[PDB]
Design a binder for this molecule. Structure first.
Ligand code: HEM
Ligand SMILES: N#Cc1ccc(O[C@H]2CC[C@@H](NS(=O)(=O)C(F)(F)F)CC2)cc1Cl
Length: 453
């Protein structure tokens, strides 16, 4: 019945995602672009190289759109990230369109992101050009964009309610992306801190949902909760609906989480690379002058006029390889793939590293170089190998939102400040710190000096 691809014999100090990714690439030279690993008896089919990822995720997108299963009695399978089947499908679709300004009133997403870019620059001023770990401030901006989308609220960076939300978020994140040693490093007294925090986040959202239910109005939705509340309205006498209070709560939490950390970390990584490559930062600052000036705030229509800057933002995401193995997929049914027969349910692991760091598409793929996204005349050159957000039907739902944040926030920063390293660029170490899921940048500090020539 099942014929899985070949692989090494089963079962196989502190091991991070980048070490895992490197092992995966070494195994592909032995067995080729598609291979199986077993862990005891649980098999995992690995897809390595662009032709394998495309054929599977894109040309057989439906079959490969499942999500890999611990299970958590936390019971978090009711949103988007952890859901499967019919439920995932409708919730994902609904979320996509709401995130593209459908059903959410007349204020745009861009507007939200631009408002936050202004506050982000205000807070950056308050560090007074003195040495700063940007971790916290860069966390708060994406978190507020999402708060605003889901609840219609943004917060001061000192507000204790906003602080608590982020703390609980960071905690669950740290727990879940712990390194391996075989098995996941974690177990101490941690499974319970997870579940508690989860319960606290879901209650905080449910409290907001109760308020929204009071003033609810088919003609005036203004955020995700209203839009979701009003879809439940139209889905009565269509029992049993996928749209419930339970799944609204789970979906909003998925979006908080997924939306705050990935962008935070990418921004922090982008500042590190800009400190290390000052000639790149200068051409970015030149381009911003020439197209935007220091007068008005950046907008998305500027990007088309700013090829160099566009290549830099692209090259940060390609270089850093934020999620080397994406998140685990699974096949939705039994499927013929090349010469293999993969049973319904089998875990699929996708090597995004093998794509982003392809040595023919991106010669010297280990180096940071904006010309990876420029043609020989200096125009913007897009690439089918740009898959930081994955590909196919499970492509990141906040793809468009994340592109906006990275561009608007990075250009606002660079429009108003120069960046100064305390360590000499020459020596500044930029190797990622070990993490079980993601490429995380090392600690660094810098000063934001308000702008002068
Ligand atoms: C630099 C920013 C970001 C990167 C690099 C990134 C990358 C990814 C990747 C690789 C996945 C997994 C896709 C797969 O399974 O193959 C994912 C999923 C997801 N992203 Fe993002 N993401 C980012 C920002 C965001 C933002 C801002 C949101 C806000 C809405 C978001 C919401 C999600 C959700 C909900 C999923 C789960 C999708 C599903 O299972 O269908 N992401 N992202
Ligand atoms: N990139 C990315 C990315 C990062 C984290 C992530 O999971 C988040 C983990 C934290 C929140 N989930 S939760 O309920 O605390 C948990 F993890 F299930 F316990 C919200 C989802 C999901 C994604 Cl897509």
């Amino acid at each position: 019945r099942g014929k899985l691809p070949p692989g090494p014999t089963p079962l196989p100090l502190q091991i991070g995602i980048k070490d895992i990714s490197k092992s995966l690439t070494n195994l592909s030279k032995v067995y080729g672009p598609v291979f199986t690993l077993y862990f005891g008896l649980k098999p995992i089919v690995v897809l390595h190289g662009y032709e394998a990822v495309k054929e599977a995720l894109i040309d057989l997108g439906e079959e490969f759109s499942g999500r890999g299963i611990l299970a958590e009695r936390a019971n978090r399978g009711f949103g988007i990230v952890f859901s499967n089947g019919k439920k995932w499908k409708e919730i994902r679709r609904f979320s996509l369109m709401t995130l593209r300004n459908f059903g959410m009133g007349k204020r745009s997403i861009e507007d939200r992101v631009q408002e936050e870019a202004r506050c982000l620059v205000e807070e950056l001023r308050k560090t007074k050009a003195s040495p700063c770990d940007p971790t916290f401030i860069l966390g708060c901006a994406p978190c507020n964009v999402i708060c605003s989308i889901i609840f219609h609220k943004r917060f001061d960076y000192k507000d204790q309610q906003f602080l608590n939300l982020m703390e609980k978020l960071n905690e669950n994140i740290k727990i879940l992306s712990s390194p391996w040693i075989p098995i996941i490093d974690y177990f101490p007294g941690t499974h319970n801190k997870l579940l508690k925090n989860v319960a606290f986040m879901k209650s905080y959202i449910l409290e907001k949902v109760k308020e929204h239910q009071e003033s609810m109005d088919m003609n005036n939705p203004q955020d995700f909760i209203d839009c979701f509340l009003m879809k439940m309205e139209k889905e009565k006498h269509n029992q049993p609906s996928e749209f419930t209070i339970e799944s609204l709560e789970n979906t909003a939490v998925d979006l908080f989480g997924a939306g705050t950390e990935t962008t935070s970390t990418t921004l922090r990584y982008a500042l590190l690379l800009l400190l290390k490559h000052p000639e790149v930062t200068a051409k970015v600052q030149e381009e911003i002058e020439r197209v935007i000036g220091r007068n008005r705030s950046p907008c998305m229509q500027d990007r088309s006029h700013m090829p160099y800057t566009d290549a830099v933002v692209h090259e940060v995401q390609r270089y850093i390889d934020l999620l080397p193995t994406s998140l685990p997929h699974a096949v939705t049914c039994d499927i013929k793939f090349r010469n293999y027969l993969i049973p319904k349910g089998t875990t699929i692991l996708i090597s995004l590293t093998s794509v982003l760091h392809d040595n023919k598409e991106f010669p010297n793929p280990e180096m940071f170089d904006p010309h990876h996204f420029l043609d020989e005349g200096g125009n913007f050159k897009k690439s089918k190998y740009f898959m930081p957000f994955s590909a196919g039907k499970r492509i990141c739902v906040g793809e468009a939102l994340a592109g906006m944040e990275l561009f608007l926030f990075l250009t606002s920063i660079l429009q108003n400040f120069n960046l100064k390293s305390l360590v000499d660029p020459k020596n500044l170490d930029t190797t990622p710190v070990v993490n079980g899921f993601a490429s995380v940048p090392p600690f660094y500090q810098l000063c934001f000096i308000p702008i002068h020539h």
